[PDB]
From a paper:
Our study reports on a new class of ferritin-like proteins (EncFtn), which are associated with bacterial encapsulin nanocompartments (Enc). By studying the EncFtn from R. rubrum we demonstrate that iron binding results in assembly of EncFtn decamers, which display a unique annular architecture. Biochemical assays show that EncFtn is active as a ferroxidase enzyme. While EncFtn does not store iron itself, its association with the encapsulin nanocage suggests that mineralization occurs within the cavity of the encapsulin shell (McHugh et al., 2014).
Through site-directed mutagenesis we show that the conserved glutamic acid and histidine residues in the FOC influence protein assembly and activity. Analysis of each of the single mutations (E32A, E62A and H65A) made in the FOC highlights the importance of the iron-coordinating residues in the catalytic activity of EncFtn.
Residue numbers in the entry:
A (entry chain C), B (entry chain D), C (entry chain B), G (entry chain G), H (entry chain H): 7 to 95
D (entry chain A): 7 to 96
E (entry chain J), F (entry chain I), J (entry chain E): 7 to 97
I (entry chain F): 8 to 95
């Protein structure tokens, strides 16, 4: 799944790759589920989709915390912006 | 770029979609630049890749804070896990 | 995301499409997470990956039950084969 | 077709991957056949498409049962939700 | 799924399109199932994969017959080569 | 092109893979050409596209006969459905 | 199949697009068949693959001639290079 | 980028593969550039797109000539159809 | 385009046409250069190398168009192109 | 991610591949961000998308300068066309 041969990648880079691709996939599921929630015409399906959507958000947050704890720039940049109140830029 | 027709999607669902795909694309850049930092045999190139990598993390962090502020479950789940101690699970 | 124009599709066919593609995406996550569990060299990440894997199984099971309740041949075939003993064929 | 190198995967993981990808592909045929069934304007084709659709559902059910027999969490989560009444999110 | 807009396609062209992509997908399943059958190390799964494989061949054959009945050049070319005996590049 | 590593695939499985992906690719061409035949506004091009469409049908037919000769379930199911009359799903 | 909306494309541009992608698809078949001919271990299959390879070349040549007749600079550049002797550059 | 293992491919097959994919990519650029030419509303951009378009045609023609010189059936079939009059089929 | 053309400004769409063109020429530059290294036929190698370097030229032309038509492209290309010393 | 085997590629070819795909990806982000900037109906998001858009341009320029320094034909052609006046096709 990597762009460079594993041969040249440090173990920490590959573990971070595993986490990053996990966040990406959960983010995608969040988005597609939210779209289906809006478009669904069956309320029983809509409740299932909306539930799965919100657990995908939890999966992403758990993996993002792992990245925060194992990558200094992630911790630094996440600390600057997350859980703030003023204008983001 | 959306999976359901825009006509059935709420405005704010589409704006969250724009933010989520942005975070996904910045996450992909972080992973790919990080792999290329490891594999590059040109130090001047490596310094550029590393700089771009870490700015992609900042772009992800800003856009993520926007998601947190505009989605009740992103705020709940991010609050649960980010900058915590002890087992993420 | 549909192969035929929404004008010619029954509303229920589109709802079933929303469910099928959700299950497919959950199955993909189960598989990918399980492969990352085997390959991970960080025990914390492995624990997150395994947790997300097993919740993806739950999401699939939930959505599959919706299909079962909303499609006569899913109900027939799932009842023939699930929770059985002896050769599946 | 695996995302991690086969050297690091347990044999059982790779066999479950084979089953999972099989279920995914049968589900996709189910969805596409059903959409084609709605859109077809040839009755003889529609009958073939609907026949193939419903056998794809059967292939998926067979492979899902194998997964249930070979994975404790699949067996648990399928047990909880399949063949129930009432809200699924309960 | 079509490469040209539906407005310019004849209805029968679109029906043949539906038949063709079905056959393609059944063929893809035949091939992947057979590879997984070779590679599987679990005999219970292998029996399932092989059963699904051969049912996919049936799905392809059924849809192929529909194409044969609804397209004269399919009928011509399938008649030239199927169920023959000699070298195939000569019939 | 294979979904499992070559070192676990039997040679005959890989040859059938080569034949199957060939039929799939010719089928794709038949469909795409036929759609372009409907949409084209230049008659000289249309005649070329149709010629190519129908030669793609022949390529698929030749390769299908190889499959029939090299796989007993292809032989069985194709014999059941090709060149028949009456409902296809009842043969 | 077009990258710009059909309503802004001239009709001649769309016909050339039909021809160009046909040549591309036939070129791909020539290449893929030639690789399979080299790799095949069944002589009866190989003869079929090679027959189809060389017909895909004929299809490409035919379609390219239509393009040549319908595009002034296809005609000019093909006339410059085809059927020459000496370094192509 | 080849479909069969390089170990079983003949040297000439791999070189023709490099030439064929090059012709394919130049043809694609001709088509996409021509579509952008029709749709562009900036005259300076349009001039660049058309200029690059006609050079991609020259690149394809050069590479096709190499194929003609290095493949007897390309030579036969191009000779049959290129620079002719009357019905191509 | 990733958003509907009806919500996009006309200049935005023209910059899209330019950006995707540069991207496709860059990809050709990269693929041609890899093929130049791997080619075992001398006349082919010369064609690939010629096509490679013309794609670079196409990219340069289309980038200049962007520079003339986007103030941030002009600023950032002015900051870094043709400089001495560390790029970061 | 290379199309030829790494064995046969010169090291500078692989490093230029790393630079080129980086530029492509930053360019893609410039384009997608700008289209999202046009289409966004939330001004706080728009400000983020637009800031990110303009930093992608800087990333592209930095990497392009590296290519210019490491490739004579990039240096030649960029010198011909960048920061000029008049018809671009003629300089
Ligand atoms: Ca605070
Ligand atoms: Ca990207
Ligand atoms: Ca996914
Ligand atoms: Ca499929
Ligand atoms: Ca056998
Ligand atoms: Ca094809
Ligand atoms: Ca023929
Ligand atoms: Ca391209
Ligand atoms: Ca125009
Ligand atoms: Ca030039």
């Amino acid at each position: 799944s990597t762009h460079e041969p594993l041969e040249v990648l440090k173990e920490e880079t590959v573990n971070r790759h595993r986490a990053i691709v996990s966040v990406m996939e959960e983010l995608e599921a969040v988005d597609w589920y939210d779209q289906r929630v809006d478009a669904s015409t069956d309320p029983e399906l809509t409740a299932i989709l909306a539930h799965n959507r919100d657990e995908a958000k939890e999966h992403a947050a758990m993996t993002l915390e792992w990245l925060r704890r194992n990558d200094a720039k992630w911790a630094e940049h996440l600390r600057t912006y997350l859980f703030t109140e003023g204008p983001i830029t």
